[PDB]
Amino acid sequence: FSFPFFTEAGMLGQYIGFDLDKGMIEAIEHSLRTLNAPEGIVVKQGDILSDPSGESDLLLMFKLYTLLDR
RNA sequence: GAAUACGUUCCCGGGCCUUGUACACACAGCCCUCACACCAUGGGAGUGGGUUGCAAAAGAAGUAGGUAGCUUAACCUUCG
Ligand SMILES: [Mg+2]
Ligand SMILES: [Mg+2]
Ligand SMILES: [Mg+2]
């Protein structure tokens, strides 16, 4: 829900955060219409101690910490 | 200068006693946080032999056996 403040500046591109807890991702992904969260943002599951492959521009690391160095 | 506690179940404080205790300066006891180094142990792709076992092949020296080639002083010579 950082989008209200990410777009307060004008980030409007594809923000897609990847968690693993599906009982938490689906307890927060239903919000798309229930809460009427902005319609310009996707979310998809994924880890990073296993899957850091792709290309993007900004790489938000919030709960990475040293769990990958664990 | 006088209207006059019917009553002690109640941590100003102590005695008698009991069970414990996560107790001995001596009373109370259920994590929120992490890459965690570095010496010791249990492992552990492959390397390598020791010592070699096993299926064999090949066999140096020596010892023994055979042996039509070859060679030779003692013996017998029939004297070839
Ligand atoms: Mg007392
Ligand atoms: Mg041997
Ligand atoms: Mg010989």
mmCIF file of C-alpha atoms (C1' of nucleotides) and ligand atoms in Angstrom:
data_model
loop_
_atom_site.group_PDB
_atom_site.id
_atom_site.type_symbol
_atom_site.label_atom_id
_atom_site.label_comp_id
_atom_site.label_asym_id
_atom_site.label_seq_id
_atom_site.Cartn_x
_atom_site.Cartn_y
_atom_site.Cartn_z
ATOM 1 C CA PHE A 1 0.000 0.000 0.000
ATOM 2 C CA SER A 2 3.095 2.188 -0.521
ATOM 3 C CA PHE A 3 1.576 3.139 -3.934
ATOM 4 C CA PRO A 4 -0.410 6.173 -2.485
ATOM 5 C CA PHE A 5 3.031 7.600 -1.485
ATOM 6 C CA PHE A 6 5.022 6.104 -4.409
ATOM 7 C CA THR A 7 2.680 7.918 -6.804
ATOM 8 C CA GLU A 8 2.460 10.999 -4.582
ATOM 9 C CA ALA A 9 5.661 11.718 -6.552
ATOM 10 C CA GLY A 10 4.596 10.061 -9.815
ATOM 11 C CA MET A 11 5.719 6.443 -9.865
ATOM 12 C CA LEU A 12 3.024 4.940 -12.087
ATOM 13 C CA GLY A 13 4.912 2.031 -13.629
ATOM 14 C CA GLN A 14 4.587 -1.682 -12.796
ATOM 15 C CA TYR A 15 5.178 -2.195 -9.057
ATOM 16 C CA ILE A 16 5.100 -5.953 -8.418
ATOM 17 C CA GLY A 17 6.231 -7.181 -4.991
ATOM 18 C CA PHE A 18 7.062 -10.849 -4.476
ATOM 19 C CA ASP A 19 6.327 -12.534 -1.144
ATOM 20 C CA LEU A 20 5.989 -16.290 -0.424
ATOM 21 C CA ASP A 21 3.280 -16.549 2.304
ATOM 22 C CA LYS A 22 0.234 -17.230 0.056
ATOM 23 C CA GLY A 23 -2.156 -17.097 3.042
ATOM 24 C CA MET A 24 -0.898 -13.493 3.438
ATOM 25 C CA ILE A 25 -0.557 -12.577 -0.292
ATOM 26 C CA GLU A 26 -4.177 -13.725 -0.958
ATOM 27 C CA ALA A 27 -5.340 -12.035 2.262
ATOM 28 C CA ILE A 28 -3.913 -8.812 0.689
ATOM 29 C CA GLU A 29 -4.426 -9.484 -3.087
ATOM 30 C CA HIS A 30 -8.260 -9.606 -2.726
ATOM 31 C CA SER A 31 -7.873 -5.861 -1.869
ATOM 32 C CA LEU A 32 -7.636 -5.011 -5.621
ATOM 33 C CA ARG A 33 -11.423 -4.329 -5.805
ATOM 34 C CA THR A 34 -12.614 -4.939 -2.187
ATOM 35 C CA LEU A 35 -10.449 -1.974 -1.122
ATOM 36 C CA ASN A 36 -10.402 -0.366 -4.597
ATOM 37 C CA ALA A 37 -6.628 -0.212 -4.790
ATOM 38 C CA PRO A 38 -5.299 1.518 -7.926
ATOM 39 C CA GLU A 39 -5.837 -0.410 -11.165
ATOM 40 C CA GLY A 40 -2.344 0.198 -12.589
ATOM 41 C CA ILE A 41 -0.438 -2.263 -10.380
ATOM 42 C CA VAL A 42 -0.016 -6.049 -10.452
ATOM 43 C CA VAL A 43 1.277 -8.369 -7.722
ATOM 44 C CA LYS A 44 2.708 -11.868 -8.133
ATOM 45 C CA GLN A 45 4.348 -14.339 -5.766
ATOM 46 C CA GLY A 46 8.037 -15.190 -5.808
ATOM 47 C CA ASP A 47 11.075 -15.513 -3.592
ATOM 48 C CA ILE A 48 14.614 -14.234 -4.035
ATOM 49 C CA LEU A 49 16.663 -16.754 -2.062
ATOM 50 C CA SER A 50 15.567 -18.885 -5.045
ATOM 51 C CA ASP A 51 14.473 -16.643 -7.950
ATOM 52 C CA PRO A 52 16.248 -13.299 -8.636
ATOM 53 C CA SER A 53 16.208 -13.537 -12.470
ATOM 54 C CA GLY A 54 14.829 -10.835 -14.784
ATOM 55 C CA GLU A 55 15.323 -7.207 -15.773
ATOM 56 C CA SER A 56 13.813 -4.132 -14.107
ATOM 57 C CA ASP A 57 14.910 -0.638 -13.087
ATOM 58 C CA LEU A 58 14.281 -0.248 -9.325
ATOM 59 C CA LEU A 59 14.745 -3.256 -6.978
ATOM 60 C CA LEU A 60 12.883 -2.516 -3.685
ATOM 61 C CA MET A 61 14.515 -4.748 -1.014
ATOM 62 C CA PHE A 62 12.366 -4.453 2.144
ATOM 63 C CA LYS A 63 12.321 -7.824 3.993
ATOM 64 C CA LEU A 64 15.442 -9.265 2.219
ATOM 65 C CA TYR A 65 17.597 -8.404 5.311
ATOM 66 C CA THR A 66 20.147 -11.227 5.839
ATOM 67 C CA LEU A 67 17.627 -14.070 5.267
ATOM 68 C CA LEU A 68 19.363 -14.725 1.902
ATOM 69 C CA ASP A 69 22.719 -14.574 3.772
ATOM 70 C CA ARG A 70 21.123 -17.188 6.097
ATOM 71 C "C1'" G B 1 -13.946 21.962 80.281
ATOM 72 C "C1'" A B 2 -18.270 18.316 79.306
ATOM 73 C "C1'" A B 3 -23.559 13.923 75.566
ATOM 74 C "C1'" U B 4 -19.947 8.718 79.060
ATOM 75 C "C1'" A B 5 -16.601 2.142 72.673
ATOM 76 C "C1'" C B 6 -23.220 -2.664 71.630
ATOM 77 C "C1'" G B 7 -17.783 -5.335 68.993
ATOM 78 C "C1'" U B 8 -11.567 -7.531 67.009
ATOM 79 C "C1'" U B 9 -13.205 -10.991 60.536
ATOM 80 C "C1'" C B 10 -8.780 -6.910 58.820
ATOM 81 C "C1'" C B 11 0.043 -6.304 56.224
ATOM 82 C "C1'" C B 12 2.986 0.124 62.405
ATOM 83 C "C1'" G B 13 4.729 -5.305 64.109
ATOM 84 C "C1'" G B 14 5.864 -10.111 66.356
ATOM 85 C "C1'" G B 15 5.397 -15.306 68.193
ATOM 86 C "C1'" C B 16 3.730 -20.760 67.376
ATOM 87 C "C1'" C B 17 3.420 -23.860 62.882
ATOM 88 C "C1'" U B 18 3.096 -26.072 57.750
ATOM 89 C "C1'" U B 19 4.368 -27.409 52.785
ATOM 90 C "C1'" G B 20 7.796 -26.191 49.135
ATOM 91 C "C1'" U B 21 11.857 -23.132 46.485
ATOM 92 C "C1'" A B 22 13.051 -21.387 39.614
ATOM 93 C "C1'" C B 23 16.620 -19.653 47.618
ATOM 94 C "C1'" A B 24 21.626 -18.473 50.384
ATOM 95 C "C1'" C B 25 23.544 -10.496 50.024
ATOM 96 C "C1'" A B 26 18.804 -15.419 50.710
ATOM 97 C "C1'" C B 27 11.429 -14.210 46.452
ATOM 98 C "C1'" A B 28 10.454 -14.200 42.488
ATOM 99 C "C1'" G B 29 10.237 -17.387 38.362
ATOM 100 C "C1'" C B 30 7.152 -19.331 29.997
ATOM 101 C "C1'" C B 31 12.150 -15.379 23.362
ATOM 102 C "C1'" C B 32 12.030 -9.874 20.280
ATOM 103 C "C1'" U B 33 16.348 -10.636 18.628
ATOM 104 C "C1'" C B 34 21.786 -13.087 13.969
ATOM 105 C "C1'" A B 35 25.940 -12.244 8.443
ATOM 106 C "C1'" C B 36 27.344 -15.150 13.441
ATOM 107 C "C1'" A B 37 33.189 -15.889 13.049
ATOM 108 C "C1'" C B 38 37.255 -19.569 14.574
ATOM 109 C "C1'" C B 39 39.621 -23.843 16.693
ATOM 110 C "C1'" A B 40 37.500 -29.565 17.697
ATOM 111 C "C1'" U B 41 34.128 -33.702 15.757
ATOM 112 C "C1'" G B 42 30.586 -36.492 12.150
ATOM 113 C "C1'" G B 43 30.636 -36.649 7.180
ATOM 114 C "C1'" G B 44 32.440 -36.298 2.548
ATOM 115 C "C1'" A B 45 32.611 -35.886 -6.414
ATOM 116 C "C1'" G B 46 37.069 -37.223 -7.485
ATOM 117 C "C1'" U B 47 43.485 -38.502 -6.441
ATOM 118 C "C1'" G B 48 46.757 -42.048 -4.900
ATOM 119 C "C1'" G B 49 49.120 -46.090 -3.651
ATOM 120 C "C1'" G B 50 50.413 -49.285 0.692
ATOM 121 C "C1'" U B 51 49.605 -54.720 1.262
ATOM 122 C "C1'" U B 52 48.112 -56.559 -2.406
ATOM 123 C "C1'" G B 53 43.985 -60.448 -2.967
ATOM 124 C "C1'" C B 54 41.211 -62.234 -7.716
ATOM 125 C "C1'" A B 55 40.531 -63.746 -13.685
ATOM 126 C "C1'" A B 56 44.581 -64.272 -16.132
ATOM 127 C "C1'" A B 57 48.789 -63.403 -19.520
ATOM 128 C "C1'" A B 58 54.101 -62.799 -19.631
ATOM 129 C "C1'" G B 59 58.893 -65.602 -16.401
ATOM 130 C "C1'" A B 60 65.065 -62.543 -14.702
ATOM 131 C "C1'" A B 61 68.341 -65.610 -12.049
ATOM 132 C "C1'" G B 62 68.780 -70.137 -9.988
ATOM 133 C "C1'" U B 63 67.441 -75.422 -9.028
ATOM 134 C "C1'" A B 64 65.566 -79.956 -11.248
ATOM 135 C "C1'" G B 65 64.071 -82.853 -15.584
ATOM 136 C "C1'" G B 66 64.166 -84.136 -20.735
ATOM 137 C "C1'" U B 67 67.223 -83.761 -25.058
ATOM 138 C "C1'" A B 68 68.375 -86.452 -32.332
ATOM 139 C "C1'" G B 69 72.425 -80.308 -32.298
ATOM 140 C "C1'" C B 70 77.240 -79.200 -30.477
ATOM 141 C "C1'" U B 71 81.833 -80.157 -27.677
ATOM 142 C "C1'" U B 72 85.466 -82.906 -24.651
ATOM 143 C "C1'" A B 73 92.262 -84.748 -20.096
ATOM 144 C "C1'" A B 74 91.403 -88.633 -15.858
ATOM 145 C "C1'" C B 75 87.608 -94.661 -16.772
ATOM 146 C "C1'" C B 76 86.676 -99.110 -20.183
ATOM 147 C "C1'" U B 77 88.775 -99.114 -24.805
ATOM 148 C "C1'" U B 78 86.887 -103.741 -28.376
ATOM 149 C "C1'" C B 79 91.465 -99.515 -29.333
ATOM 150 C "C1'" G B 80 86.693 -97.498 -35.055
HETATM 151 MG MG MG C 1 5.826 -7.878 58.280
HETATM 152 MG MG MG C 2 53.824 -61.058 -4.612
HETATM 153 MG MG MG C 3 72.172 -73.535 -16.247
#
